[PDB]
Write a protein that binds this DNA or RNA. Structure first.
Ligand SMILES: [Zn+2]
Ligand SMILES: [Zn+2]
Ligand SMILES: [Zn+2]
Ligand SMILES: [Zn+2]
Ligand SMILES: [Zn+2]
Lengths: 187, 618, 586, 200
RNA sequence: UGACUGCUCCCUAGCAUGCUACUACCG
RNA sequence: GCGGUAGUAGCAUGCUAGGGAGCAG
C-alpha cells in the first residue's frame, strides 16, 4: 500500500492541488482540486483495501499448509515406529515350538489362550502370602501346566533379590508380600 | 441364550481369538482371523490374505492393535491373587500403582472458620475427602469381576420385553454416516494401548484420511478385530474408601463405533420431553420442565426410586447383547443382514469380552460393561428400561385373577399370557395396548441407571404394577445381586419432588410470582470441593477465580432452604469471591504502580447474576 | 516433504514434476528453472493444478491463487492472487533463500534426456550434488529405457541350451549378452513366482544362465529393474594429505614379495583416497593383500563393481592372509562362499556394491573403476565410512553399459570422478611392474595410451601375428555376422596345429555362436572378461564399428593372451602404427 | 522472578545472549541491551516470533500482539514495539530506578575473560558485579576445558604406556597436573567406571 | 499412567448479519 | 434536497474456531 500504481497519480494530484491552493486561482481551479483529490481517494478505494485482504488470505493459506506438512511428517514417523516395533518384537517368537504345534491343528488354527501355555520359556508366578506359596512353589523346582519348571530368582514389591533360604513361617512378616517368582522350562 | 448355558461345560482355555501363521515378504506373522464367542459360537474371518508383499498403513493399524502378537511374544503368567483367567505378561516385572492424597487449601479453611463455621454440633460437616490408596489396589479392584456369573436369561419373556423396549425407542432416528461428518470433542485425550506410546488421539485422527477411515469402517463390517484395553485408577473426591477405575478403549474401536452410532447417539441427546433425559439442562428452568413431564396423568401419584448394586460389574451377557441389538435396530436400509451381525460381533469382542491389561499383564474380562467406549451411557439406560418392564410384567402375571375387580386388567392379563407363552411372533396391536397402559400407570424418567418413577398407588397396592418387591425378586433372579431395601426411597407426597435424583435434592420454591422446582446439592460436597484440590489447580485463590464462580453457580438454590447454614454456605462463597478479587487488584497494584480502571466485574459478588440462571428464558 | 534444495542448500517444499527424479528446488532457483524449460509442473504439499471440477489447465503462471485452492481464469473468484509474481514462485520459506547464478547447467542436466556424448560431458561438468543428481537421473532413464522391450514368453521347451521362445506384441527384442540378464518370473494362478536368472543368446534361443530350472509352458522373461533410491552421501569425501599417519600403524616387519607397493602404502597412510594407474594385470590382485600384512591393524575393505570381477580380491585372501579375519556377504547371486556370510564386523570385508551393509572401517580397496560411475562409488561411500581408501584400475578400459550412447562415442577421461582425477588432478600412483606380458604390448601401450610409463618387461617370444585383411560387415537385429571372417577362421588357423587351444574373441557373440558350429571352441564376450583369460587367445574383429573400433576396446584385448594371440587389425582404426609379422591371406 | 542485580526491584528478564543470564529490571535491562551485542533476552517465555515457522531472534525485531509474540516479517497489523520509551516490555514495568552507569556491566558481561583488562574490569566493579564476574570466570573455564577431544585409549601396552587417541579434529589439551582426567567406559550403550588419571 | 457421553461459566479470534455515526461519487 | 454506491469507525446479535475451569452418571 506504498508502491501501488495509483500512488504516483495521487502524489502528482495532491502536488498540483497544493500548488494551486498556494496560487489561489479561479473557483473552477478550486473545484478541480476538490474533484481530482476526490478521485485520488477514489483510486485508493480498492488499492489500500484489497491487497490488505489478499495478504490475509495468503498468510492463512501458508500457515494451513505449514500445519499440513507437520502432520504429514508425523505420519511417517508413526509408521516407522510401529513397523520397527513389529519387526523387533516378532523375533521373540521362538519359531521351533510354535511352528511344530500349529502343524498339529486341523488347518493351522489354534486358540490364542494356549500359545503362551506351551511355547513360553519363562514362567512368572505371583503369590499373595506364605500359605499360598506353600502349595505351588514348593522346593527349588515345581510343576505346573503339564511341564517341569525350576526356580531361578525370587523378588518382592521393592524389587530386590531375596534368597529362598529366608522364606519361612516366622520370617514371612518381615517382607513386602507380593512375591514374584520367575522360572524356566526344564528338559 | 442356549449357547450361554451350553458353554459352561467346556474348558476355559479354548475361547478367545483364533490365530494362524501368515507370511508377508517372506516373514512369518501371527494374526487373529476369527474368534470363539461364548454366545455367538464360532465366527470365521473373511478378508485375510495368506500372502502379501508390503503393507501400507491400515494393515499396520489393525495388526498392532491385536492381542495375538503381544500375547505370543510374552511370558506365561500364573497369578494367584485373583480367580480371573490370566493370559500372559508383557514386561519383566509387574507395575504397582498408588493414588496420592489431596492437597490442603488452608487459606479457605481459615476464612471459613473466621465466619463462625465448623462448630461442634452444627448441621453441615465435612464428609467428602480425597481418599488415598495403597499399592496393589488396581488388581484388587479388578478382582470384583468375580461377581458376574454366566446367567441364562428367560427367553420367551425377553422376546417380548425387547418389543416393548423397542416401542419405547421409537421417535429417534439413526443410521450410518460418512466419515467426513463425524463430530469429536476434546481431541487431545488418551487413546488405548499400545497406541498411547506415540501420541494422543489427535495424531491418529490427523494422520488418517477420509478414504482411509472409510476403508477401516467398511472393513470391520465384514471382519473381526479383537483389541486390548487399559485400566487406570481415577483421582476424584468421594465418600467411600473403595477405589474407582476407568478403562480406556483402543483407538480402532472408537474410530468405528463413532461412525456407526453417531446419528442415533446425537438424535437422542437433542429431544426434550421423553422417557430418556440424557442432554436436558438442569439450568434455565429445566428441572421444573422435567418434573412436570413426569407427572403426566397419574391418578394417585407416589414416587419410587431404585438403585442396582454393582451396576457395571454384575451385568449379564445376554442383557448387554439385547442392549446393543436394540440400539442397532434403526439400520433398516444402510446395511445388509450379515453386516449388522458382523458389527454386533465386533462390538461384543471389543467392549464385552476384551483382554483387560490391569496392571502390567493381560487378563480376560468375563463380562460386564467397560465404561470407556461411546455407548455406555445409553446401553445402561436401555438396560434400566428393560429391567423395569420385565419387573412390571412379572408383577402383573403373578396375581390371583379371581380377585381382580376390573374387567379390563383381567382381560389384559389373559392376553398377556396368550402373547407370552402361546404365540410365536409379535402382535403389534397387543404390544401397543400394553405400552399405552404402561405409560398411563407407570410413567418413567430414566438416566444412565438412575431412575425416578411416578406410579399409580391404588393399583400397585393390589399388585397390578410392580411396587418394590417385584423389583427385588427380578434383580435377585436375573442379575445375581440383592437390592436391599435400604437404598430405595419412597415419597408419599408430591408437593416436594423426588427425594434424590442424580445427587440433587429437589425443593419447591416461590420465585417471581409462581412456584418452581430447583435442585440443590449436598452442602458437604460443595465445601469439600472448595477445601480440597489437586496442586496448583487452585492450592490458592488468586490464580484461579473461575473455580469459585462455577461452584457458587451450582450452589445458589441453597439460599431458599429453611435451614439456616445452607444459605450461609452461599453467602460465604460470595464473600470469599469478593475478597479474592479485591486482593488480586491490590496485589497487582502495589507491585505495579497502576491497576484496574474499568472492571464491570462487580456483578460477580452479588446474587443478581447467579439468580438469572434459574429463570425460564433462553 | 520438506528438505534442502539442490543448488542453495536452502530449506523449501517444492518439486519440479517434469524431471524424472523430482528434486527439491529452492524458491529463487525453482523460478529460475521453471521459466526457461518445458517444466510447467511444480509440486508441493499439494500439486499446483486447477483442481476445479472438470478442468485440466496444468501450468504455473496459468493459475491464480484464490481461496484455499488454486484456479485459472476460467474458475478464479474475483479475490485472487498470481502465483508467479516478483520473479519468484510462491512456496514455503519465502524469506530464506539465496538462489544460484548457476542455472544453465541445471537446465542442461534436466533438459538433456541422456541421448548423446554431450550428456555425460555435462554429467561430469557440474557440481557434486549436481553430478550425483545426474547419475541418479541416468539410472532412472536407463531403467525406463531397458524396460521398453517385450516379455520373453516361452510356450514350449525343446531341450536345454535353447528354447522355443516368443515375446509380447509390438515391443522390440532387446540385444544379446550379459548386460541383458533376464530374471523373469512365472504365474501359478494369481501372481509371479520363481523361474531363475538367465541371459538369452541366438542358437532356438541359447540361455547362458548361471542358475538352473525346468522351464515349462508360458514361462516369460523380462529385464527386471528395481527402485533406485536417491543418493545421500557424496561420492567421495574431500581429501587432505595428513601431516602424520593417524589411525594407521606403521609396522616394522614386512614381506617383500611386493617391492613396488610398500612405497605406495606409506604415502596412502597419509592421504584419504589413492588410485594406482595400473596397466592390465600389473599384479593388481596383490596390492590390498600386501597391505593386509604390511598394516595388519586396520579394517581393510575389499570391493569391486561386479560379483564376478571380485574374483581377484576374493582368491588370494585365503591363500596368503589368515582365514578368520575375512567375511563376504552373498545375497539370496551364486558367488564365492569360502568366507563367512552375514558377518558385518570383520577385519577384512569382501563384497559388491549390490549387497553390502553400512559399516565403518579404516582402509578401503576398490577394483574395476573403468566400468564404474559416480553412482557406484557414491553407494559405497554412503555405505562405509573409513580413514583411508585405495582404488585399483584405470580409465583406459571398457566402460559401463552406456546403452544410451547412440551418437559419437564417449571419451576416456570423461567416465567418472576417478578417471578424470587420474588425468587432471594427477596420477596418485603409476606402475611398470607388470610381470604378466612381454615387451610387445608393454611398449605398445606405453606409446599408445598409457603415458609411456612402462619398461621392457621380458622375452618377446614372437608368437603374436598381425594380418592385412579387408572383411565385410552384415547386421541382423542388434548383432553382426561376418562370414568372410568366419570361414577364414579355419583358413587362418591353417599353418600350425596349436592355435585352437585358445578362446574366441568377438564383439557380437553371434559370430562366435555360428563359428562354434564349425569348431566348438569356447565363446568369449569382450565387455565383461577382465581377469578371466587363457595363455593363448584368438581375437577375430568381426566388425569395423566404434563399438569395437574405439581407442581402448582392443587395448586390453591384445594383452589377453600371454605371448601369442591373433592381432588382425583389419579395421582401419589403429592398424597402421604397430610392427608385427604378416603373411598373405591364403 | 527476583530482584535485579543493579536496582533490587522485582523483574522477570534474563539476558539471553549473556553468559549466566542475570536478573535485570526493565530500565537497567534496556541500558544493558542498547549498548552491546545483547540481542537476546529471556522471560517466563523466550522472545522469538511464535507465529508458525518463524526465523527471527533479535529482541527489537519482535512486536507484541495477542497471547503471541510476532516479528516484522510475520506480525499482523496490530503491532506493539517491545522496545519502546527507553524500557523493554516486561513484568513490573513501573517499579524501576535504573542507572546510566552501566558501562561497567556492559563491558564485564560481554567480557570474554581473555585479556588482563578483563580481570582488571573484574577488579573494578560493584560487589554484585564481582559475584557475577566470578561466576562468569568459572563458566568460561568450564566452557574452555571441554574444547578438546576425548582421549580414546584404543590399545594397551605395559604399564605407564597405552595407545591413546582422540575424537575427530579437536586440538591438543594441556598435559600438566592442572586437569584431573576422568574417563568412563561403555559396555555397548552407557558410560561407566574408568576412573581418574593424569596424563604425561 | 489419565476413558465415553451431557449440560454450564469465562477469555480471545474469525465470519456473517443487522444497526449506527463520518468524509467522498452519482441522479 | 432525496435516493443509491464504495471507503474508516463505534454498537449489538448469532454462528464457528481455540484455550482454561466446575458438577452429574
Ligand atoms: Zn449401517
Ligand atoms: Zn525440472
Ligand atoms: Zn480451471
Ligand atoms: Zn534494575
Ligand atoms: Zn517472527
Amino acid at each position: 500500500f506504498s508502491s501501488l500504481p495509483s500512488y504516483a497519480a495521487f502524489a502528482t494530484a495532491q502536488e498540483a492541488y497544493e500548488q494551486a491552493v498556494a496560487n489561489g486561482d479561479s473557483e473552477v481551479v478550486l473545484k478541480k482540486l476538490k474533484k481530482s483529490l476526490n478521485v485520488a481517494k477514489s483510486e485508493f478505494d480498492r488499492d489500500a483495501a484489497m491487497q490488505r485482504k489478499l495478504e490475509k488470505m495468503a498468510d492463512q493459506a501458508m500457515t494451513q499448509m505449514y500445519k499440513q506438512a507437520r502432520s504429514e511428517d508425523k505420519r511417517a514417523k508413526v509408521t516407522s515406529a510401529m513397523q520397527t516395533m513389529l519387526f523387533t518384537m516378532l523375533r521373540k517368537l521362538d519359531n521351533d515350538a510354535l511352528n511344530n504345534i500349529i502343524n498339529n491343528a486341523r488347518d493351522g488354527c489354534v486358540p490364542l489362550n494356549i500359545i503362551p501355555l506351551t511355547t513360553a520359556a519363562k514362567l512368572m508366578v505371583v503369590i499373595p502370602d506364605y500359605n499360598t506359596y506353600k502349595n505351588t512353589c514348593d522346593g527349588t523346582t515345581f510343576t505346573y501346566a503339564s511341564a517341569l519348571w525350576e526356580i531361578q530368582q525370587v523378588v518382592d514389591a521393592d524389587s530386590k533379590i531375596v534368597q529362598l533360604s529366608e522364606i519361612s513361617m516366622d520370617n514371612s512378616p518381615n517382607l513386602a508380600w507380593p512375591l514374584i517368582v520367575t522360572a524356566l522350562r526344564a528338559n | 441364550n442356549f449357547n450361554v448355558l451350553f458353554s459352561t461345560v467346556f474348558p476355559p482355555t479354548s475361547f478367545g481369538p483364533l490365530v494362524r501363521k501368515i507370511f508377508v515378504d517372506g516373514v512369518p506373522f501371527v494374526v487373529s482371523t476369527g474368534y470363539h464367542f461364548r454366545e455367538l459360537g464360532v465366527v470365521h474371518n473373511q478378508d485375510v490374505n495368506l500372502h502379501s508383499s508390503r503393507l501400507s498403513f491400515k494393515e499396520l493399524l489393525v495388526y498392532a492393535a491385536d492381542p495375538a502378537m503381544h500375547a505370543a511374544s510374552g511370558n506365561l503368567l500364573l497369578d494367584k491373587r485373583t480367580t480371573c483367567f490370566s493370559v500372559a505378561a508383557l514386561t519383566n516385572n509387574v507395575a504397582f500403582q498408588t493414588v496420592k492424597p489431596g492437597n490442603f487449601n488452608k487459606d479457605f479453611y481459615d476464612f471459613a472458620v473466621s465466619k463462625g463455621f465448623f462448630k461442634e454440633g452444627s448441621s453441615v460437616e465435612l464428609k467428602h475427602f480425597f481418599f488415598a490408596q495403597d499399592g496393589n489396589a488396581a488388581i484388587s479392584d479388578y478382582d470384583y469381576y468375580r461377581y458376574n456369573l454366566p446367567t441364562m436369561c428367560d427367553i420367551r419373556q425377553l422376546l417380548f420385553v425387547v418389543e416393548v423396549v423397542d416401542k419405547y425407542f421409537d421417535c429417534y432416528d439413526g443410521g450410518c454416516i460418512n466419515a467426513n461428518q463425524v463430530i469429536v470433542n476434546n481431541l487431545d485425550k488418551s487413546a488405548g494401548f499400545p497406541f498411547n506410546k506415540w501420541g494422543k488421539a489427535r495424531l491418529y485422527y490427523d494422520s488418517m484420511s477420509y478414504e482411509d477411515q472409510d476403508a477401516l469402517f467398511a472393513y470391520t463390517k465384514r471382519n473381526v478385530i479383537p483389541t486390548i484395553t487399559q485400566m487406570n485408577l481415577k483421582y476424584a473426591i468421594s465418600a467411600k474408601n473403595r477405589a474407582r477405575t476407568v478403562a480406556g478403549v483402543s483407538i480402532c474401536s472408537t474410530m468405528t463405533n463413532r461412525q456407526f452410532h453417531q446419528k442415533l447417539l446425537k438424535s437422542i441427546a437433542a429431544t426434550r420431553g421423553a422417557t430418556v433425559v440424557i442432554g436436558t439442562s438442569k439450568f434455565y428452568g429445566g428441572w421444573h420442565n422435567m418434573l412436570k413431564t413426569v407427572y403426566s396423568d397419574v391418578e394417585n401419584p407416589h414416587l419410587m426410586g431404585w438403585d442396582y448394586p454393582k451396576c457395571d460389574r454384575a451385568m449379564p451377557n445376554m442383557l448387554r447383547i439385547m442392549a446393543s441389538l436394540v440400539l442397532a435396530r434403526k439400520h433398516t436400509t444402510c446395511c445388509s443382514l450379515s453386516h449388522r451381525f458382523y458389527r454386533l460381533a465386533n462390538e461384543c469382542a471389543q467392549v464385552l469380552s476384551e483382554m483387560v491389561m490391569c496392571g502390567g499383564s493381560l487378563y480376560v474380562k468375563p463380562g460386564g460393561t467397560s465404561s470407556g467406549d461411546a455407548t455406555t451411557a445409553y446401553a445402561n439406560s436401555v438396560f434400566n428400561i428393560c429391567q423395569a418392564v420385565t419387573a412390571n410384567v412379572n408383577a402383573l402375571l403373578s396375581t390371583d385373577g379371581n380377585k381382580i375387580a376390573d374387567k379390563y386388567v383381567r382381560n389384559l392379563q389373559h392376553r398377556l399370557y396368550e402373547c407370552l407363552y402361546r404365540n410365536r411372533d409379535v402382535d403389534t396391536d397387543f404390544v401397543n395396548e400394553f405400552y399405552a397402559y404402561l405409560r398411563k400407570h407407570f410413567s418413567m424418567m430414566i438416566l444412565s441407571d438412575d431412575a425416578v418413577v411416578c406410579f399409580n398407588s391404588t393399583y400397585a397396592s393390589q399388585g397390578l404394577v410392580a411396587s418394590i418387591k417385584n423389583f427385588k425378586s427380578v434383580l435377585y433372579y436375573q442379575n445375581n445381586v440383592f437390592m436391599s431395601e435400604a437404598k430405595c426411597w419412597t415419597e408419599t407426597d408430591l408437593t416436594k419432588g423426588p427425594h434424590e435424583f442424580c445427587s440433587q435434592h429437589t425443593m419447591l420454591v416461590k420465585q417471581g410470582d409462581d412456584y418452581v422446582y430447583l435442585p440443590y446439592p449436598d452442602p458437604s460436597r460443595i465445601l469439600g470441593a472448595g477445601c480440597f484440590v489437586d496442586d496448583i489447580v487452585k492450592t490458592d485463590g488468586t490464580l484461579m477465580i473461575e473455580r469459585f464462580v462455577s461452584l457458587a453457580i451450582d450452589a445458589y438454590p441453597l439460599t431458599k432452604h429453611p435451614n439456616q447454614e445452607y444459605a450461609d454456605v452461599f453467602h460465604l462463597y460470595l464473600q470469599y469471591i469478593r475478597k479474592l478479587h479485591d486482593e488480586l487488584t491490590g496485589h497487582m497494584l502495589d507491585m505495579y504502580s497502576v491497576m484496574l480502571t474499568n472492571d464491570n466485574t462487580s456483578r460477580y459478588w452479588e446474587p443478581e447474576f447467579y439468580e438469572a440462571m434459574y429463570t425460564p428464558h433462553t | 516433504a520438506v528438505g534442502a534444495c539442490v543448488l542453495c542448500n536452502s530449506q523449501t517444499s517444492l518439486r519440479c514434476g517434469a524431471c524424472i527424479r523430482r528434486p527439491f528446488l529452492c524458491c529463487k532457483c525453482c523460478y529460475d528453472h521453471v521459466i526457461s524449460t518445458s517444466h510447467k509442473l511444480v509440486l508441493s504439499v499439494n500439486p499446483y493444478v486447477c483442481n476445479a471440477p472438470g478442468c485440466d489447465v496444468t501450468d504455473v503462471t496459468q493459475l491464480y491463487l484464490g481461496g484455499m485452492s488454486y484456479y485459472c481464469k476460467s474458475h478464479k473468484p474475483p479475490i485472487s492472487f498470481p502465483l508467479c509474481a516478483n520473479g519468484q514462485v510462491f512456496g514455503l520459506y519465502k524469506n530464506t533463500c539465496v538462489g544460484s547464478d548457476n542455472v544453465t547447467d541445471f537446465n542442461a542436466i534436466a533438459t538433456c534426456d541422456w541421448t548423446n556424448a554431450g550428456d555425460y560431458i555435462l554429467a561430469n561438468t557440474c557440481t557434486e550434488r549436481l553430478k550425483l543428481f545426474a547419475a541418479e537421473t541416468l539410472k532412472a532413464t536407463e531403467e525406463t529405457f531397458k524396460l521398453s522391450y517385450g516379455i520373453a514368453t516361452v510356450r514350449e521347451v525343446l531341450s536345454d541350451r535353447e528354447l522355443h521362445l516368443s515375446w509380447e506384441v509390438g515391443k522390440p527384442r532387446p540385444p544379446l549378452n550379459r548386460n541383458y540378464v533376464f530374471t523373469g518370473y512365472r504365474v501359478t494362478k494369481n501372481s509371479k513366482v520363481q523361474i531363475g536368472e538367465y541371459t538369452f543368446e541366438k542358437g532356438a534361443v541359447v540361455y547362458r544362465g548361471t542358475t538352473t530350472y525346468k522351464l515349462n509352458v508360458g514361462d516369460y522373461f523380462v529385464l527386471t529393474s528395481h527402485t533406485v533410491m536417491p543418493l545421500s552421501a557424496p561420492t567421495l569425501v574431500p581429501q587432505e594429505h595428513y601431516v602424520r599417519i593417524t589411525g594407521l600403524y606403521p609396522t616394522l616387519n614386512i614381506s617383500d614379495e611386493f617391492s613396488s607397493n610398500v612405497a605406495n602404502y606409506q604415502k596412502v597412510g597419509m592421504q584419504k583416497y589413492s588410485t594406482l594407474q595400473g596397466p592390465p594385470g600389473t599384479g593388481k590382485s596383490h596390492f590390498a593383500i600386501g597391505l593386509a600384512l604390511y598394516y595388519p591393524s586396520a579394517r581393510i575393505v575389499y570391493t569391486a563393481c561386479s560379483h564376478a570381477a571380485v574374483d581377484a580380491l576374493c582368491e588370494k585372501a585365503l591363500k596368503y592372509l589368515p582365514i578368520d579375519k575375512c567375511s563376504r556377504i552373498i545375497p539370496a547371486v551364486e558367488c564365492f562362499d569360502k568366507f563367512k556370510v552375514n558377518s558385518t564386523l570383520e577385519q577384512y570385508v569382501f563384497c559388491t556394491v549390490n549387497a553390502l551393509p553400512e559399516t565403518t572401517a579404516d582402509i578401503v580397496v576398490f577394483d574395476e573403476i573403468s566400468m564404474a560411475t559416480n553412482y557406484d562409488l557414491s553407494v559405497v561411500n554412503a555405505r562405509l565410512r573409513a580413514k583411508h581408501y585405495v582404488y585399483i584400475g584405470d580409465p583406459a578400459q571398457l566402460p559401463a553399459p552406456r546403452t544410451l550412447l547412440t551418437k559419437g562415442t564417449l571419451e576416456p577421461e570423461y567416465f567418472n570422478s576417478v578417471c578424470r582425477l587420474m588425468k587432471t588432478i594427477g596420477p596418485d600412483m603409476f606402475l611398470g611392474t607388470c610381470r604378466r606380458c612381454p615387451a610387445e604390448i608393454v611398449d605398445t601401450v606405453s606409446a599408445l595410451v598409457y603415458d609411456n610409463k612402462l619398461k621392457a618387461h621380458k622375452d618377446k617370444s614372437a608368437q603374436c601375428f598381425k594380418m592385412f585383411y579387408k572383411g565385410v560387415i552384415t547386421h541382423d537385429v542388434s548383432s553382426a555376422i561376418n562370414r568372410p571372417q568366419i570361414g577364414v577362421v579355419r583358413e587362418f588357423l591353417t599353418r600350425n596345429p596349436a592355435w585352437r587351444k585358445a578362446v574366441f574373441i568377438s564383439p557380437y557373440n553371434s559370430q562366435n555362436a555360428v563359428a562354434s558350429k564349425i569348431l566348438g571352441l569356447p565363446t568369449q564376450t569382450v565387455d565383461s572378461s577382465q581377469g578371466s583369460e587363457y595363455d593363448y587367445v584368438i581375437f577375430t574383429q568381426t566388425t569395423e564399428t566404434a563399438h569395437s573400433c574405439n581407442v581402448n576396446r582392443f587395448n586390453v584385448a591384445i594383452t589377453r593372451a600371454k605371448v601369442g594371440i591373433l592381432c588382425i587389425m583389419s579395421d582401419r582404426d589403429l592398424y597402421d602404427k604397430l610392427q608385427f609379422t604378416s603373411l598373405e591371406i591364403p
